[PDB]
Amino acid sequence: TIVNRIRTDVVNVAKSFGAEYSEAVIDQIFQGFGEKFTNTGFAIRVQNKRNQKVDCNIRYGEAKENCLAWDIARESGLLSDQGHPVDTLIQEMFQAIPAIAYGADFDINYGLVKIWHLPKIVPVEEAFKIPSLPKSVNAHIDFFKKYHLDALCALTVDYRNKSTNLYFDAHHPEQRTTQFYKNILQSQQFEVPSDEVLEILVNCPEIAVTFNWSSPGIERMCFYTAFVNRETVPQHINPVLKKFAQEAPALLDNPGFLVGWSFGPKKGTYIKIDVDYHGLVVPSFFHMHNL
Numbered sequence: 001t002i003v004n005r006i007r008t009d010v011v012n013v014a015k016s017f018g019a020e021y022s023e024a025v026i027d028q029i030f031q032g033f034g035e036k037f038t039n040t041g042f043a044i045r046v047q048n049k050r051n052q053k054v055d056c057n058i059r060y061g062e063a064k065e066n067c068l069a070w071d072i073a074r075e076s077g078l079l080s081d082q083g084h085p086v087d088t089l090i091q092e093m094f095q096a097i098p099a100i101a102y103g104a105d106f107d108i109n110y111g112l113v114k115i116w117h118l119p120k121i122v123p124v125e126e127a128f129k130i131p132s133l134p135k136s137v138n139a140h141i142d143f144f145k146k147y148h149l150d151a152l153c154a155l156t157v158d159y160r161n162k163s164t165n166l167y168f169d170a171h172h173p174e175q176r177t178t179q180f181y182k183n184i185l186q187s188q189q190f191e192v193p194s195d196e197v198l199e200i201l202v203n204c205p206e207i208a209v210t211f212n213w214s215s216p217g218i219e220r221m222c223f224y225t226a227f228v229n230r231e232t233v234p235q236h237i238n239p240v241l242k243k244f245a246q247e248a249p250a251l252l253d254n255p256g257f258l259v260g261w262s263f264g265p266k267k268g269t270y271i272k273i274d275v276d277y278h279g280l281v282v283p284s285f286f287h288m289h290n291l
């Protein structure tokens with residue numbers, strides 16, 4: 001079956017990258033969501049957030065107007081009340097902005113970590129009405145204006161990290177210059193990467209900005225780029241990129257990949273790479289950003 005091949009592949013990725021994982025967690029996740037993994041946008045992700053440690057996430061998305069993952073996770077025990085503003089945030093999101101899709105994200109050592117809300121691209125003003133957003137979001141209106149973060153293409157609630165992301169379509173001509181990325185990164189006193197990475201960033205069609213309830217500032221920013229096959233991933237930039245690009249499983253032989261470049265302060269400066277397991281994610285990425 002597809003679901004058994006997926007579960008096998010996930011375990012094999014975790015063992016190959018030495019990622020911490022829990023067989024009991026994986027059993028819970030697949031009990032609730034394995035059927036969903038078989039026939040929707042499904043990806044396996046690895047990242048090097050923590051020092052000398054690779055983490056493995058699995059995630060899916062589908063074009064439903066309601067947030068089915070929330071009901072499944074509540075019923076299957078994968079999401080309990082946190083005693084925290086995240087408890088109702090996703091509900092508020094789907095009440096405040098109409099969704100064309102939703103998604104969910106799982107750390108295979110923990111369980112459900114995030115749920116995504118995917119609207120049609122809307123002005124970012126539509127998010128300022130969401131009551132339980134961290135106050136730092138409204139406090140950053142002038143920042144969003146200045147860096148042409150006006151076109152909101154997704155929202156996410158990170159239940160484990162207790163944080164939220166806003167995702168923007170990087171449509172503005174200024175975002176085709178390396179100076180834009182140097183300036184938005186320096187504005188947060190984040191690390192500025194090499195010129196190589198900068199000329200990769202200028203092609204990023206999407207920018208994520210992370211907020212939380214523990215600071216007035218931005219926690220980290222992420223620039224996302226897709227690659228149509230293993231060969232065009234910039235494997236030389238980092239060993240995790242090379243190893244995952246050459247080894248990641250998929251249902252076709254040469255799958256595409258989504259690469260996120262994260263930047264923070266002792267920070268979240270790191271790489272994320274996801275494999276387009278079924279082949280739907282990468283085209284939907286280009287389509288949602290009109291490329």
Ligand SMILES: [C-]#[N+][C@@H]1[C@H]2c3c[nH]c4cccc(c34)C(C)(C)[C@H]2C[C@@H](Cl)[C@]1(C)C=C
Nearest residue numbers: 041042043059060061103116154274281285
């Ligand atoms: C299918 N789908 C999902 C989609 C998604 C959820 N949140 C997003 C925020 C920005 C962009 C995207 C998403 C897409 C459309 C590029 C997409 C990515 C893949 Cl990796 C995911 C997570 C499924 C495994």
Ligand SMILES: CC(C)=CCSP(=O)(O)OP(=O)(O)O
Nearest residue numbers: 156165210222224258260274
């Ligand atoms: C397009 C990408 C692959 C999904 C967007 S959500 P994310 O996984 O990048 O969010 P975080 O890394 O948890 O901040």
